[PDB]
Amino acid sequence: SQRLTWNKSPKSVLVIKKMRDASLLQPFKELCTHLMEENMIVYVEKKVLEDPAIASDESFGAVKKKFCTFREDYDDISNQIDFIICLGGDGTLLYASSLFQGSVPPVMAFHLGSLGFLTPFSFENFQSQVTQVIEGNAAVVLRSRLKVRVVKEKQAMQYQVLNEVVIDRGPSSYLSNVDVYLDGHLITTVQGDGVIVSTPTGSTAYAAAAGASMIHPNVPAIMITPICPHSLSFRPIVVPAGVELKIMLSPEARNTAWVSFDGRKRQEIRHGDSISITTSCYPLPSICVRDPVSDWFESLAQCLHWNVR
Amino acid sequence: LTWNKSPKSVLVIKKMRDASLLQPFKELCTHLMEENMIVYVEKKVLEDPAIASDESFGAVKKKFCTFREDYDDISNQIDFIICLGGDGTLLYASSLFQGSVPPVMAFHLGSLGFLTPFSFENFQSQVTQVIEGNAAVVLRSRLKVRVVKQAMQYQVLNEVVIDRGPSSYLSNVDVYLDGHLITTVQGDGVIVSTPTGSTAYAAAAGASMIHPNVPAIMITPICPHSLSFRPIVVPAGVELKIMLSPEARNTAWVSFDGRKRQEIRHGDSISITTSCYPLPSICVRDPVSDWFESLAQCLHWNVR
Amino acid sequence: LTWNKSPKSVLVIKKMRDASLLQPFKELCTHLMEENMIVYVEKKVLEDPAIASDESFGAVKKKFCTFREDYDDISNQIDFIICLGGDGTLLYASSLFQGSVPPVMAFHLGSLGFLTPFSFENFQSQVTQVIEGNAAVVLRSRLKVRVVKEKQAMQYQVLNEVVIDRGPSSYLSNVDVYLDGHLITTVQGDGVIVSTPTGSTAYAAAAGASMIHPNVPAIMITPICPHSLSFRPIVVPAGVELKIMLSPEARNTAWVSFDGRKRQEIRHGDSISITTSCYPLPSICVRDPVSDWFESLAQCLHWNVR
Amino acid sequence: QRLTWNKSPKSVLVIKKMRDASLLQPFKELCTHLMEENMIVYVEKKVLEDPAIASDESFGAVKKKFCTFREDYDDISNQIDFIICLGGDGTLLYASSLFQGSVPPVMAFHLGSLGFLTPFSFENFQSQVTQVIEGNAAVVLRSRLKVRVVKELGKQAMQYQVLNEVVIDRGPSSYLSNVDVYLDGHLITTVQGDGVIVSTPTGSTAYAAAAGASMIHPNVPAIMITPICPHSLSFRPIVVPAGVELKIMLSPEARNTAWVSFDGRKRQEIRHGDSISITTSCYPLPSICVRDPVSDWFESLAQCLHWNVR
C-alpha cells in the first residue's frame, strides 16, 4: 500500500519487449510515439534496435533516431532510468528483473495476450494510464527477490531471481536426493523430483503447480515446496525472509542435480557444490492498476481459476 | 528474540481435573517458592479437593496469592507464566490475557505438542536459566476478532473456524478483505488462522506449515465445493470482514479456538485483524530448531 | 451398455417443494399421455394445491396413477423413471427403491449436475428415443449400509456416500475402521466418508478424493480433515465389507448421515457395516458413459479448464 | 484367489540384481535349499557370468547343476513354473519385463526395506518356500498396462507391458509439455505441465503416489491418470475403467517434443505424429502374498509409506 512518489519528475523510461514477436511491433512504436510526444528519453535494448522491422520502416521519424541505447555494457548506473515499461507476458518482467541486478526502477508492465500475473495494466487506452503513472501517483508492490550464490568446489556465482529457484534432476532418471539446511541446521532431506525455493511473487508461478499455497506478494516470507516428494507427509513450508537456506547434495548421493533460476541458466550441481539462498535487499517495485489486494485477487480469478463457482 | 531479566512474580497454569498433573505442579511450586518466586494460581486451583487437602503441601499452599482477572494490574504484577499440560493450557492462558501477555514457559507431560517445547525433566535448571534471562522468545501473533450482531471482542491464538455447527446444509459465506468482496466460500466452512495455528486444525484442512515468525494471516477452506480453492495467505495488516451471503437460507456457527461456539445469522459480521498484543513463548534452544523439531515429532512431517 | 424393452408404464418424480417445475411437469405428463403411456406419481404431488387447481390438466391429472411407496412391490409396475430437478431428485428416487431400480432418465432445469445428463429442451425426441430402447445406461453401484445399535438393525441403501462426523456435538471424532474383520485404521478428525464411484464427484470430492468413473467397481474411503498429514484417500475392492465403530477409548458419540438425510447418533457398541449393494441404479446417459461423465466434469466442477 | 497347481511345481526361476553383493549368501542358501528339495533352478546368463557366483568351491556342485534361462522360447514352452525374486521392487519390475506374455506366480523376498511388491521376508525362508510349493498361498493378480508406441517417420511400432506406470514428461529438455489425452477416440483433455502418469493400481503407491494420486488396492480393475505438476489448480487425478483405450499424443500446436518412460527404463522421445496407446494387458502378474491381499496391502502401506500413522 505504497504510493509512487517521485523525488524528481521522471524523464527517462526504459522500454523492454519480447523479441521475435511480430504482434508486439505495432504497439511498441505507438508507445514510443507517445513517449517522444511527451518529451522523454526512451531507452531500448540494442538487441532489438537492430531488428530489420524496427529500423527499416517509415516509423523512423524523430523516435527511432532518438532511441538511446540501454547501458547494457557492464552496469553503468541504475539512476539513468526512472521507470520501466514492459510489453508482453511475465517472461518480459522476469527478463527485466534479470537485467537489473541492483536497485530496480519501478516497473509498469503491459499485457497483450493473456492477463498474466506480473502484467496488471492493459494496453487499451495506454496514454491515460501512462500520464497518470507519470504525473500522478500509483500504488506499487515491492516484490521481494531471492539472492542466490552457487559455490563449486571454489568458484562462486551470484544470481537474483524473482519467481523461484528449482533444484531438480536433469537427464538423470533417479529421483534427486538433496539436503536442505536452514541457518546452518539440517532442516530436512528432499527425496523426489525436486525442491522449489520461491518468493511470494513466485507462489502463483510453477510453485503453485506443486501444491504451494497462494501468498500475497506483500507477505515477507520464503516458500519451500517439494516437487513430487517421495513421502506423503511432506507439506510445503513457509519460512521467515531473514533466514539463509543452504541446499547441498547428500554425502551418499550417487548422481548430480540441476538448478534453474526462473527457468533459465540451468546448471549442474555436483558433490561439494552448495546453493545459498537469502532474501535480496533490492526488491522489484511493480506498479499496480488500482491497489495490490484487488489486483492480486483479480489476477487469481483470471490468470488462475481460484474459487470459481 | 532474547528476553530481559526476571523479577519475583510467577503465574502457574495447569489443566484442571487431571490427577497426573498433581505431583509435578506442587513440586514445581516447591522449587518456585524455594528461592525467591511468588506463585499465582487460579481461584479454582485452590478449590481442588486434593491440592488443599495435602498436609505436606499445606505449608506451601499458604503463600498462594490468587490470580484474579480484574484489570491491567494483574498483568503488571506477573513477570512470566508457566504452563503444565498440552497446548490447550497455553490456549487457556492466552484467553486469560486479552491485553499484554507475559512470556509463557510451557511444559509438556504427555505429547510434545507445538506450544509446549520444554520438558519437565530437569526442570530446575531450565527454570533457573529462564530466571537468569537467557532464553529465546517467539512473538506469536494473535487475531483480534470482533463479532457485531451488541458487539463482542475476542483474542484468538490458534484460529477462528466458521462452519455449519449444530446445523447442516452448508451455506454460503462472503469474505471481505479491506472492504472488497474477494471470494464466497461454499463447503464445510472457512478457517482464519495465525501462523501459530498453521499446524493446528488449519493443517488438517490442507494448509501449509508456516513458521510463527512470518507476519501473515491464513485463509483455509474446510472442504470447499470447488476444486481450485487453494488456501491463501494475506498480509497481517489487512482487515478481514466475514458476513453471511445475502441469499443464504440457514445460519452459520463461529468458534474461537474451539470454544465459545456462537451462531451467526443475517446482519452479523465478523471482523478479523492482527492483534497488537502478541503472545511471547519461551524457546528451548532457538525458534527455527524448536519449530522444526516439533514439526518432525508431532506431525511426522517428512518423516520418510 | 445398451438395453431395450422399456414400454408402457413410467414413473415421474419431481421436487416436492413448489418451484418452476410445474410447467415442465405438466408438459411432460401431457406428452406421455399422448404417447399412450401410464404415468405414476407420488401421493404428495397430487395433494399439491397448484397441480390440482387448474382446468388445463383435467383428464391428465385424473389419469395420474398414485405410486405406493411400499404397499405394492413395484417390480413390473414401473418400467421407467423420469426425474425432474437436480441430483437431489435422483437421490430421492434411489431412496424410494430399496430393491431393483428401473432405468432412470433425469432432466436438469438449473445446473447440469452429474446425475442429470438430459436437457429438458426438445424432450419429446429424447423420450421417444428412450422408449424405442436406443440409449446407453450406466449401472451406478450403491452401498448397502446396516446400523446395529445396543439389537435393532437398519437396512439403508445409499447412492452418493455415507458420512460419519462429529454431528451436532463439537468434539472431533475418533473412530475405527475394519475391513473383513481386520482393523484398517483409526480415523481422527472431522470424520470419514465411504462413497461409491458415483459419489466421487459428490461431497467426497470436496475432501480431496480422486474423480472415479462410475464404471469402476470400487469403494472409496476419504477422511474429512484428518489429524495426520499422511492420511490419503484410499480405494478398496467392491467386494469388501467395511465396519466402522467408535473406538473403545472414545469419550463421546459420533453421527452418521446417509446422503445427508438420516443424521443419527452412533454410540459405544453401535456398528456400521457397509457393503456393495446388488441392486445398482441404472442411470440413462445422453451419448455414452465416458463422454457424458467428462462433459459433466467439465461443466459442473470446472476441471482442467484453461 | 489361491494357488492351484495342475501338477506339483518342479522348475523355478530365481531373479536377483546383478549389481549388489549382499545377495550372494541368500542366493546361495536359497539355491541349495531348492536343490535339496528336488527342484530345477533357472538363472539368467549374467548370473552365471558373475565372477563371484561361479568362483565358489562350495557352490560349484549346484552351479554346475544350474540351468540357464534363455530370454526367448520361454513363452512358447512354459518351462518356468514358479518365480522367486531377491531384492527390492526393481527386481520384480525386471521380472515382469522379462515375461511379456503369461507370467508364472512370483514370490518376492526383501532383504532391505519391506517395499510393496516384496511381501515375504527372508528369515525362515525354508518353511515359507515349502508352504508355497504345494500349500494354498493367496495371490494377487496385479493388472499390467499394454503400451504400444506408434512412431511416424510406414511407421515403426513397438510394444511394451508395464507394471508400475508409464510417465510422459518434458524429458531432458524444455520447460513445459502439452499432450492431448483421448479415450476411445474422444479427446479427454490437454495435459499442460510437467507431465502425466498412466498407472495401474499396483503403481498407485509408486511414483503416481508422489504426484497426489490415491492409494488403490491392486484388486480394483482400473487405470489411473495423474498429472505431474499440472498448470491448473483444478486438475485432479482420474480413475477410469480398465477396458478403455487411452491415446496420448503431442498437441498439434506443440513446439517441443516430449519423453516417455516405462517403469523408469527405455526413456524414448515422442515427436509430432507419434502416439501412445495404453490398454489393459490381459496378462496380469500373479504376486504371492504372505497372509491375505487386504492385510498384506495395508501392512505394506503402513510400513513402507507411513500411511496414517499417529
Write out residues 265-304 of C within 8 Å (CB-CB) of B: 301-303
User: Largest alpha-carbon pair distance within chain C?
Assistant: 65
Indicate where chain A has its CATH 3.40.50.10330 domain(s). 2-144+283-302
CATH topology (fold) of D145-280: Tumour Suppressor Smad4 (2.60.200)
DSSP letter, residue D4: -
CA distance between the termini of chain A: 30
CATH superfamily to which A2-144+283-302 belongs: Probable inorganic polyphosphate/atp-NAD kinase; domain 1 (3.40.50.10330)
Which of helix, strand or coil describes residue D91?
helix
Amino acid D109 reads: F
Neighbours of D121 (CB within 10 A): 13
| β-strand pairing of C173-179 with C242-246 | antiparallel
Which residue in B216, B224, B300 is closest to A219 by CB distance? B216
Q: Quickly tell me which residue has 523525488 as its cell.
A: A7
* Closest C-alpha among B62, B104, B54 to residue B79: B104
* Cα separation, C28 vs C82, whole angstroms: 9
Class of domain B10-141+278-298: alpha beta
Tell me how far apart the alpha carbons of residues B278 and B257 are, in angstroms, rounded to a whole number.
16
Cα torsion through D235, D240, D245, D247, rounded to 10 = 10
Residue with cell 498436609: B55
Query: Torsion angle of alpha carbons C264, C266, C272, C278, nearest 10°?
Result: 0
Cα separation, A188 vs D43, whole angstroms: 42
Question: Alpha-carbon distance C129 to B180, whole Å?
Answer: 51
- Is residue A282 within 8 A of residue A160, CB to CB? The reply is yes
Closest CA to C130 of C105, C108, C112, C106: C105
A307/D contact by beta carbon, under 8 A: no
CATH topology of domain A146-279: Tumour Suppressor Smad4 (2.60.200)
Backbone torsions φ then ψ of A133, nearest 5 degrees? -75, -20
Look at the block and give the residue holding cell 499455497: A213
Beta strands in chain B (DSSP E): 10-14, 39-40, 80-84, 104-108, 118-119, 137-140, 143-148, 151-156, 159-163, 172-177, 180-193, 209-210, 216-224, 232-235, 240-244, 252-256, 259-264, 269-274, 279-282
Count of other CB atoms within 10 angstroms of residue B203? 27
Which residue in the block uniquely carries the three cell numbers 546361495?
Answer: D28
Which CA distances in Å does C99 have to A51, C69, C155? 76, 12, 11
How would you classify residue C122: left for phi > 0, otherwise alpha for psi between -120 and 50, otherwise beta? Answer: left
The whole-angstrom distance between C295's CA and the closest CA on chain D is 9
Residue type at C239 in one-letter notation:
G
Compute the distance between CA of residue C276 and CA of residue C278 in angstroms, rounded to an integer: 7
Closest approach of D150 to chain A, Cα-based (Å): 23
**Nearest to residue A196, comparing CAs of A237, A149, A137, A141?**
A237
Q: Which residues pair with B193 in a beta bridge?
A: B159, B218
Cell numbers of A101, please? 541486478
Domain C143-276 sits in CATH at 2.60.200.30
Reference A193, options D226, B203, D89, D248; nearest CA is D226
Distance CA C97, CA C73 (A): 10
Residue A90 is among the residues annotated as catalytic for this protein: yes
CA distances from A94 to A109, A143, A163, A165, A166 (A): 11, 12, 8, 13, 15
Domain D11-143+284-303 homologous superfamily, CATH: Probable inorganic polyphosphate/atp-NAD kinase; domain 1 (3.40.50.10330)
CA C254, C260, C264, C269 dihedral sign is: negative
Alpha carbon distance D72, C7 (integer Å)? 58
Query: What are the residue ranges of CATH 3.40.50.10330 in chain B?
Result: 10-141+278-298
Which one of C87, C111, C225 would you mutate to disrupt binding with B, by most B Cβ within 10 Å of its Cβ? C225
Asked if B300 lies within 8 A of C230 by C-beta distance, the reply is yes
Rounded CA-CA distance C270/C150 in Å is 6
CB contact under 8 A, A232 and D264: no
If you count them, how many residues does chain D have? 310
Q: What's at D167, amino acid-wise?
A: V
In chain D, where does the domain assigned CATH 2.60.200.30 lie? 145-280
User: Cell match 437421490: residue?
Assistant: C91
What Å resolution does this PDB entry report?
2.5
Catalytic residue positions of D, numbered: 89
Residues sharing a CB contact under 8 Å with residue D69, sequence separation 6 or more, in sequence order: D13, D42, D43, D44, D45, D80
User: How far is residue C120 CA from its own chain's centroid?
Assistant: 20
| Assigned C-alpha cell, B155 | 483474542
Contact residues, chain B, for A182 at CB < 8 Å: 288, 292
CA distance A171 to D172: 4
Under a CB-based contact definition with an 8 Å cutoff, are residues C100 and C75 in contact?
A: yes
| Cell 495455528 belongs to residue | B197
Q: Which helix (H) or strand (E) holds D68?
A: strand D67-68
Q: Which fold has domain B143-274?
A: Tumour Suppressor Smad4 (2.60.200)
Q: What are residue C107's DSSP bridge partners? A: C84, C118
CB pairs under 8 A between A and D: 40
What is the grid cell recorded at C19?
418451484
The residues, ordered by sequence, that sit 6+ positions from A216 with a Cβ below 8 Å of its Cβ are A200, A292, A293, A296, B232, B233, B234, B235
3 state DSSP class of B209: strand
Chain A environment of C112 (Cβ under 8 Å): none
- C-alpha A203/C-alpha C138 separation (Å) is 42
Please tell me if residue B209 touches chain A, with a CB cutoff of 8 Å. yes
Burial of B89 (0-12, 13-18, 19+ CB in 10 A): buried
Chain A / chain C CB contacts < 8 angstroms: 12
- How are beta strands A214-215 and B232-235 bridged, if at all? parallel
The CA distances from residue B248 to A76, A133, B170, C256, D207, in Å, are 61, 42, 10, 25, 43
User: According to CATH, where is 2.60.200.30 located in chain C?
Assistant: 143-276
Bridge partner list, D187: D182
Measured at the CA of B30, the angle between CA B25 and CA B31, to 5 degrees, comes to 100
Query: Which bin fits C113, alpha (ψ -120 to 50), beta or left (φ > 0)?
Result: left
Q: Give domain C2-141+280-299's CATH superfamily.
A: Probable inorganic polyphosphate/atp-NAD kinase; domain 1 (3.40.50.10330)
Residue C223: enclosing H or E segment and its boundaries? strand C218-226
Residue B171: name the closest of B84, B244, B254, B115 by CA: B244
- Give the separation between CA D307 and CA D310, rounded to whole angstroms: 9
Helix (H) or strand (E) holding D93: helix D89-98
Cell, residue D83 = 518365480
By DSSP bridging, strand B180-193 and strand B159-163 are antiparallel
Technique that determined the structure: cryo-EM
Question: How far is Cα D5 from Cα D7, in angstroms, rounded to an integer?
Answer: 5
**Dihedral sign of CA atoms D169, D172, D176, D181 in order:** negative
User: Residues of C71-82 as b/e, b for ≥16 C-beta within 10 angstroms?
Assistant: eeebeeebbbbb
SS3 call for D130: helix
Residues of C in contact with B301 (CB under 8 A): 229
Per the listing, cell 531438480 goes with A168
Region(s) of chain C under CATH 3.40.50.10330:
2-141+280-299
Burial class of residue C242 in the structure, from the number of CB atoms within 10 Å of its CB (0-12 exposed, 13-18 middle, 19+ buried): buried
Rounded Cα–Cα distance for residues C101 and C68 (Å): 15
- Give strand pairing partners of D195: D169, D228
Quote the CA–CA distance of C84 and C96 in Å, as a whole number.
15
For B303, which of D232, D233, D306 is closest by C-beta distance?
D306
Sign of CA dihedral B264, B268, B273, B275: negative
Select from D186, D221, D295 the Cβ nearest to the Cβ of C217.
D221
Query: Chain centroid to CA C225: how far?
Result: 24
Are the CB atoms for B174 and A203 separated by under 8 Å?
no
Cell, residue B37: 518466586
CA distance A111 to chain C (A): 18
Which residue carries 429442451 as its cell? C121
Q: Give the largest CA-CA distance in chain D.
A: 65
Distance in angstroms (rounded) separating the CA atoms of residues D255 and D273: 13
Shortest CA distance from D174: residue in chain A: A263
Beta carbons within 8 Å of B157's beta carbon, 6+ residues apart: B90, B91, B94, B95, B140, B142, B143, B194, B196, B197, B257, B279
What are the residue ranges of CATH 2.60.200.30 in chain B? 143-274
Burial class (CB in 10 A: 0-12, 13-18, 19+), B87: buried
CA torsion sign for B256, A233, B283, B27 is positive
Strand-pairing partners, residue D278, are D147, D246
Residues of D in contact with B230 (CB under 8 A): 233
| Chain breaks after residues in chain C, where C lies over 2.5 Å from next N | 150
Q: How far is CA C183 from the centre of its chain?
A: 29
Integer angstrom CA distances of residue B94 from A80, B7, B115, B159, C172: 53, 21, 11, 12, 22
The catalytic position among B54, B70, B87, B286 is B87
Interhelix angle B123-132/B22-35, rounded to 10 degrees, is 40
Chain B residue with CA closest to D304: the answer is B304
Residue C17, H or E segment: none
CB pair distance less than 8 Å for A227 and D307: no
Q: Which amino acid is it at B222?
A: I
Task: Write the secondary structure of chain A as one string of H (helix), E (strand) and C (coil).
Answer: CEECCCCCCCCEEEEEECCCCHHHHHHHHHHHHHHHHCCCEEEECHHHHCCHHHHCCCCCHHHHCCEEECCCCCCCCHHHCCEEEEECCHHHHHHHHHHCCCCCCCEEEEECCCCCCCCCEECCCHHHHHHHHHHCCCEEEEECCEEEEEEECCEEEEEEECCEEEEECCCCCCCEEEEEEECCEEEEEEEEEEEEEECHHHHHCHHHHCCCCEECCCCCEEEEEEEEECCCCCCCEEEECCCCEEEEECCCCCCCEEEEECCEEEEEECCCCEEEEEECCCCEEEECCCCHHHHHHHHHHHCCCCCCC
Place of cell 509430432: D272
How many other CB atoms are found less than 10 A from the CB of residue D7? 6
Reference A41, options A93, A88, A92, A82; nearest CA is A82
Cα–Cα distance for residue pair B103/B115, rounded to 1 Å = 12
Q: Is B53 left (phi over 0), alpha (psi -120 to 50) or beta?
A: alpha
Selecting from D233, D305, D310 the residue whose C-beta is nearest the C-beta of B228 gives: D233
The H or E element that residue C177 is part of is strand C173-179
Cross-strand bridge partners of residue A83: A13
Within chain A, all domains assigned CATH 2.60.200.30 are found at 146-279
CB B180 within 8 A of CB A294: yes
- C chain contacts of residue D239, beta-carbon cutoff 8 Å: 197, 200, 210-213, 216, 218, 235
Q: In this structure, how many other beta carbons lie within 10 angstroms of the beta carbon of residue C138?
A: 23
